Write a protein that binds this ligand. Structure first.
Ligand SMILES: CN[C@@H](C)C(=O)N[C@H](C(=O)N1CC[C@H](C)[C@H]1C(=O)Nc1ccccc1-c1ncccn1)C1CCCCC1
Ligand SMILES: [Zn+2]
Length: 94
């Protein structure tokens, strides 16, 4: 939940989109990169450059931002981009 990104080398959106150059999975690569994720090159495993949170086993029609907020609500990239209200809404039911 720190304000300092875990992986500065992947802070650049262009650095992240590059990792998806040959992405074959259903979840949209631009949406993934915009949501802070880069591909690890091992199945559909991705990692956020900021919070360091990893996610795998993406399902059809899943939204990168929603999943990001669900699993890593303390991510400060998410807070900076989407804002707290977005995070609040994802966690509304619990
Ligand atoms: C359906 N949408 C996807 C994006 C999603 O929610 N992925 C989750 C995920 O990647 N998680 C959950 C938190 C965890 C830090 C991360 C993860 O890396 N999980 C694992 C990765 C490799 C090996 C095991 C796990 C794992 N182990 C125990 C419980 C959950 N995941 C998780 C994958 C396994 C089945 C439950 C869901
Ligand atoms: Zn994050």
């Amino acid at each position: 939940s720190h304000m300092l990104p875990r992986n500065p080398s992947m802070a650049d959106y262009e650095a992240r989109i590059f990792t998806f150059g040959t992405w074959i999975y259903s979840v949209n690569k631009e949406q993934l990169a915009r949501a802070g994720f880069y591909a690890l090159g091992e199945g559909d495993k991705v990692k956020c450059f900021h919070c360091g949170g990893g996610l795998t086993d993406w399902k059809p029609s899943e939204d990168p931002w929603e999943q990001h907020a669900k699993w890593y609500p303390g991510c400060k990239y998410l807070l900076e981009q989407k804002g707290q209200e977005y995070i609040n809404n994802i966690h509304l039911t619990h």
